[PDB]
Amino acid sequence: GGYDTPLGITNPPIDELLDRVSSKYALVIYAAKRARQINDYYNQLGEGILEYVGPLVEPGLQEKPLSIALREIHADLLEHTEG
Amino acid sequence: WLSAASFQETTRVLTDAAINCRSDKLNGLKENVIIGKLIPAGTGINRYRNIAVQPTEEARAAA
Amino acid sequence: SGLTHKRRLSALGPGGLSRERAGLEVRDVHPSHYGRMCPIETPEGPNIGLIGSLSVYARVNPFGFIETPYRKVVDGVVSDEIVYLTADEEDRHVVAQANSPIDADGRFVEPRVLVRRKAGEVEYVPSSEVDYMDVSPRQMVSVATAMIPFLEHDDANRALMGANMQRQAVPLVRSEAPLVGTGMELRAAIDAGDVVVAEESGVIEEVSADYITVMHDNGTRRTYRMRKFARSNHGTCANQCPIVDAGDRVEAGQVIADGPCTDDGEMALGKNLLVAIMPWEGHNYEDAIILSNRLVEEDVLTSIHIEEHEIDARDTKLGAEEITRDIPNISDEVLADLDERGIVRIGAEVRDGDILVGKVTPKGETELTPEERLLRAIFGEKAREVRDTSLKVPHGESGKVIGIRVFSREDEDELPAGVNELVRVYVAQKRKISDGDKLAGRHGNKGVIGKILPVEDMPFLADGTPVDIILNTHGVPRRMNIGQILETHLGWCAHSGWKVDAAKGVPDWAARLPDELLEAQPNAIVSTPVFDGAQEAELQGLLSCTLPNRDGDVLVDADGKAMLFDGRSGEPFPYPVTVGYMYIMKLHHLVDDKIHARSTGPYSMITQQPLGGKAQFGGQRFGEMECWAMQAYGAAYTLQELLTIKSDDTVGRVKVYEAIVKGENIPEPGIPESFKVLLKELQSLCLNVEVLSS
Amino acid sequence: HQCGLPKLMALELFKPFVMKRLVDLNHAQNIKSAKRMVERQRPQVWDVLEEVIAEHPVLLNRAPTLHRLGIQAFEPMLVEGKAIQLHPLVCEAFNADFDGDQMAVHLPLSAEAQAEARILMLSSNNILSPASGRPLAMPRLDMVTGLYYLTTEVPGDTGEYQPASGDHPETGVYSSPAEAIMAADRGVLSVRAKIKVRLTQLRPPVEIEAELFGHSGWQPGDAWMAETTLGRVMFNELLPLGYPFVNKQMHKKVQAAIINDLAERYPMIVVAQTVDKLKDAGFYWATRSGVTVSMADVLVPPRKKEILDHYEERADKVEKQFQRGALNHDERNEALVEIWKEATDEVGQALREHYPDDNPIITIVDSGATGNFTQTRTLAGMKGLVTNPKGEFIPRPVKSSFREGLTVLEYFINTHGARKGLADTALRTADSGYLTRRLVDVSQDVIVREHDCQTERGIVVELAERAPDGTLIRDPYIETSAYARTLGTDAVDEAGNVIVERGQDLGDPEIDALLAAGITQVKVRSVLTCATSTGVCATCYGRSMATGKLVDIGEAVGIVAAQSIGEPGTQLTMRTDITGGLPRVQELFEARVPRGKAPIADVTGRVRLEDGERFYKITIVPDDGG
Amino acid sequence: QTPRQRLPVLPCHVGDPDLWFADTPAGLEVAKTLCVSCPIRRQCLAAALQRAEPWGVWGGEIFDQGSIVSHKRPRGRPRK
Amino acid sequence: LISQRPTLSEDVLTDNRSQFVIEPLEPGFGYTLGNSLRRTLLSSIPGAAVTSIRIDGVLHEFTTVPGVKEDVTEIILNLKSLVVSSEEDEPVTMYLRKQGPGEVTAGDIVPPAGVTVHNPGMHIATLNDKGKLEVELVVERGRGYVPAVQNRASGAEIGRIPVDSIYSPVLKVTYKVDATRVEQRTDFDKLILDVETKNSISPRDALASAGKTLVELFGLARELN
Amino acid sequence: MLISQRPTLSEDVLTDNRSQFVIEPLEPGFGYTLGNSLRRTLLSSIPGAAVTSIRIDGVLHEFTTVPGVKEDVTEIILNLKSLVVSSEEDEPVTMYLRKQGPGEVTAGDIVPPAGVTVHNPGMHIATLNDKGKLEVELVVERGRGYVPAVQNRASGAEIGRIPVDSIYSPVLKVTYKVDATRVEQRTDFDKLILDVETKNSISPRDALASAGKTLVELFGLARELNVEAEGIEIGPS
């Protein structure tokens, strides 16, 4: 668990991420569906609230929704069940 | 048969599968590329495509 | 390259065999080629050995066979009756070798001389069956491959690449002659015809930038017009400039005017740049090249390119097109340069995408949407019943405008039917050197330009002179082209100048050296010919005595190395480093010809794939090997996306575009159009194709 | 994970994204105004473009795309200029030189596709080649020369430690590598001397730590002495904190072993940062090392004329005996071929004996950076023999070296072999593409489906057969036969206890335990014996080498297998009438009857060796009574 | 952060547009004074003159159904 | 502990080339100090050079004046070698009247107030009896090197030929240290600089400018507290 | 003219004494022109103090081991070499420490005379075992840079006075690198990233201040030759 702090696209580290899922494919689909929910919530905030809710962690200034979703998964804030 | 038509004798490969009414299965990787659906390997299998994503309820109340 | 495109022997074409029919025993080198076709030079693609060049001394028979000169040595006494022979007589007789030690009157010296035989054999014969000695060495070699110095120290692969990329240089704007070459550079320039040559001896009367009036001996005069900045066939300038004065006397055959790549008559394709062969901090890895900024500042490597753009005015079904200042609703800002009748003025600097010719086409009248009707009623504008098709400069092109040639059907000129006015604009950007451009030496050591450093953090000798290009040292031993190292050592010797100390007579290495190579001025030129050059002993002996610069300073010691400081850190390098004066060219595979991108542009008609080519936008081909790569990675979605919505799904492409622009999620892909085409074909061929749900 | 990008390309690439963003910042109120602003390239688009381009991965690809690592995903960053910059380590995977080769950029759009290019195809997560498991981000030529010069040790160098006493102490010891660095920045020390530092932040090797602390040396804290160089300390600080001290000379095989063990024991992000620090120090010490090529650094052997006269007398005697008609033409050419091969090997031996160790050319060769010794032999020594257009040898042969320069006839002879190699390389490229196409079209359906086939069958593995004197000599084919395969049954040494149970991954410590226990025949579980319907179960296939762990349940092992087999074409030379090259592989998978049909037995027992005239005829004695 | 044209500077479209069609002469006086700070009163006023406006504040000036007004009389008996 | 500070001495070889010697320094300091002064000198001395010219009979860079041996681009590459020296930072103009046969040296340029041309003997172009040459030039100030600033970046007419300029009045700078480094640990360096400048300003003035730039820069790192 | 962008300076902390400065942004170039000079001045300019030579009873020429103590003579020497101290008197002051009997000798056991200031008592220097007695003198003088062990040219003056190497300087390790921020809006301005770690006699901030002072005097030596010249200006904060 000792390294330099990762920077750019590699934060959070994938080898530490992967203990939350079973396999890389499931992790990819996990993050992509969460990012679709995030972007739908961001686009649909002008009117009344839809069934999707929020970046559960606080984002940066201009942060990509996929990166927000990955930090959520690393934050141990979601749960899922495969097909 | 759809994959088999890509090699040779496409007239011949069709014209006997036409007699047998040989329905294809769409299970390989060569045929799903042709008809433009998801390949059944990697992130295309039904274990990894029906994944439901939802927040945990201990963090639902923090929102 | 203009010279060596002629004297080319192909092998394919009508009446000849194609490349698929080219069996492997026609691309080889049959040993009758010695003197009749050069074995070095060939295109290196899928055309190796099919296309070859003539030799230097060859000559074609009345019947179309290829002759070759030979001295006719009689009874061990070498005569001078030069006798042309063909392949059959060469197979008949016994042929000697070019550098045989003749005893200064005709007699041989050693009794067992080298000989080529009938079957391509190399033997040893007593000196009485010899009846034909070669005229010279280098008879087996081409024209381009007779210009590489120290060719006999190089491998044939790298010699092939060097002689192949000697025909891709560019004409610079200064064109300095090389410090060391072979003597056959003057003849290849005055025989290439791109140098104006005086025809009768006389006295120059009046020079200019554009015409020379040579006054002959008897009354008559003659004026030689020049060609100032005419476009070549590949987009380079073809400028000429005189090299004489108003009072000189010239003789019939003297060079009077340099051409594109000439200096004082002889050929010159590049500049002499100081070089160093250490690896430098990873910026030259797997043979990249770094350069000083002095090349950019002093315009050492600065070509000129000339581009031609063309547009025309046909007759349509809905009327006739026209060339006007007036266009659809574009402001007077873009009309700041256009002349009274369309095209831009001469000298108006353009940028990317600006208007060059203002042409607007009669589009007829279509029906009106009610919303457009409401907006036009609101704003109160012209109906604009004509559609604009203006010639605009494509991406990344700029620079001045030289000439605007205009042809008209009204003006009694030859035009295709329906076309009324045909116009042509010449745009001439001056292009500096930049990273991404290709540089090459003479021995096929090419490489792109890595990082143009500033001048101060570039290593320098003890005199303060910074080097100008740093090569890499891992690329020399594994390719076997040490001709560049020998050329570099001789380049430093020829630059700094030598004087052999003949105090106690001539030293031992300088026995075979001629007179007046014992000493030479600094920055004087030499010439080593191809297969009889300077020996390594002569190179070491010249490097021993290399008279100092301004102070008492021999910057380069006996090994050829030198002591380099480091401009970035400051400390000296701990080990001495080879320096010396190489000669490198600039290649016409510049980056701006090659770089193109495409977001969304035109499309095919019969299919719906995007177009291809860099003249239009063009998109990259996504081959089946890359399909295999994506499948083996396991990314299904990227593969499906690359095969549905970026190339085929014509109703989904615009949905993707508007979803990107609005900011929503990307929608799910639809059925690609190729599958529907295949489905309709299979239904058309009386095959009851049905899909199954359950 | 980064890569460059020119701005005049990236602006064209990201045009709709930048249109949306600069409408949202009101620099242009409508889309047509945004498009005209982008076309005129007003200066606000760059400050918009950086914010729209951060953390948005793009792809790279170089045609031809041989194997799975041909397409990798990189995070872009803006480069003023016109050429795509590239990380120097990944050129080994892309097989890209810098002679003018061109790569192509694509761009993923959807959230799914960006997730795939961020997690799967990211360049930092592809270090091991899937064909063999060796690394492909290992430092190549230039940095390898740098690390070799850094970690070599020179006796007799400046400021060496000597224990010369009775008058004054050792004067070689140093309290800390900080003090050693200060002394080397002064004029005293060289990098490659031999000193006795007192390290504190480097973990000692296993034997020394067992000697001193036994087991509890937590090397964050403690202090110990070591008679290394300075350079090995300086290089060894690049490796992670837990890694034991190395103290060797960094030949390329040693660096492959270090990076392989590191990737086995540590996460990929640690491996990536380690190999990047390795690249930086490798380049910085490569430019200090003074590797230059000059004609004073190419020495001819001083015995070549004596060697050539001694072989020349034998060649002249053979030619004289053919001149008298004592033998035939093919015997003449065969004898001359043998004479000149012996002469070439003799002069190569003399050259390698003559060359000192610290020469630049032999340093580049010996480090494992590039090349072999034959190229040095041709560059100084003799060329040897050159082949024919048909392929036979020329019995002339060449007796000169490229430093001394060839003559006209010898250059003419060399041209045949040069042109032949040049054409046949492209021919072999096309044939390798054909073979890869056939193998892909056969095995494009084997994908992992279940997790456990639940059989008991399996193949056996030789694994370090017993010596006749009696010891376990390790078999040379283990990494391609026994590593990374799960165990079908357990292994028990001499009917005692088990050592490794069923289901273990069978890596190096299990290998060492089985070798120490003294067994050869294990029965690994593998595919061939997989009992699923279509595709293979995950637990049979073993450890996927691209990850270093077990495979998932969706991997396309068939396409990985086909690309890993068909990629090392264009390095399969046949020989100098039985096939032994690339077409030998081609007829194997086609399974046709080979030309060199040597028959096999049909029953055991004694045999009757028996020859007739000009062709043999052997019968076999049966023991079955048939 | 905008770097747009002079549209927020343009005091025509700063607030509610129905203010500019006020049915109270006092209520449009603020509107008429608001185009005292307008950069483009000449061309706007000229355009409104040539296009024969029927209504509203134009160029910092109200318009009748045909032409220019000083200012409209309110409801009721006009005064002395 | 050495109780001394180094004293900058001086030595003049020729009128535009002179030496400077600093002694004594710490060991391992002479190389770095000389390199810092060299990198300061070679690219950060403000000077003055011709930016844009405008001949009368031409419209762009790619033609020929009627009656000259050279052409427009050759006149450009001759004029890039000029050495002018201005006082104020504003664009001043200097002209060139020449008529009839002879040679156009650089000495025929008539400067306005402030500026001056330091090498009148430079050959620019040659003229026959039918040639007529009228060219103005613009002189700026500035430092370093700047590429050709485009015409459309300005608002000029068609005739305004732009030329990339090089204002740096220094040419070739080297050093050489001499480490005493004796066994009594009385060790010190002796930095022997060597400046040669392109006749515009004296090497003393060039070195003074470099030293003032470095002092002003290191005042920041001094000014933390 | 003007530098057109004022370079800032922002310190940092990793340990008690290991800072990591960063200067940003500079002119193109200039990162290597000031970072290398700053590194060398930091290493070899700041005064400090250390031990020059020791002399220990019992051993006069037998440099193998000392009676009573358990570790080697070389272990004692290179243990004592890493002892942080400061002084005032430019003459070579002397020291003395004495301890008998069993126990562990730490650096606080030495008695300091006037001027000297041992900045860590808590550091092991010996472990005297089984009724031994250790008596060691030390020579401390101030200095700069890092000299090697001075050869005993006065070997007739003393025979047991073994000289040692002496790290005079207070800093210990300086690394640096550059970067290439904002190549389009700011046209390739460089970001210097220093890294200085020192022993705890002084702090990195005042270390940087003293380095800047000696450098600005050294370059003002060159400046005060023609003060009426023109160079690049920065301005106020």
Ligand code: SF4
């Ligand atoms: S009416 Fe007056 S304030 Fe309103 S937009 Fe027109 S000119 Fe401007």
Ligand SMILES: [Mg+2]
């Ligand atoms: Mg290549």
Ligand SMILES: [Zn+2]
């Ligand atoms: Zn199985």
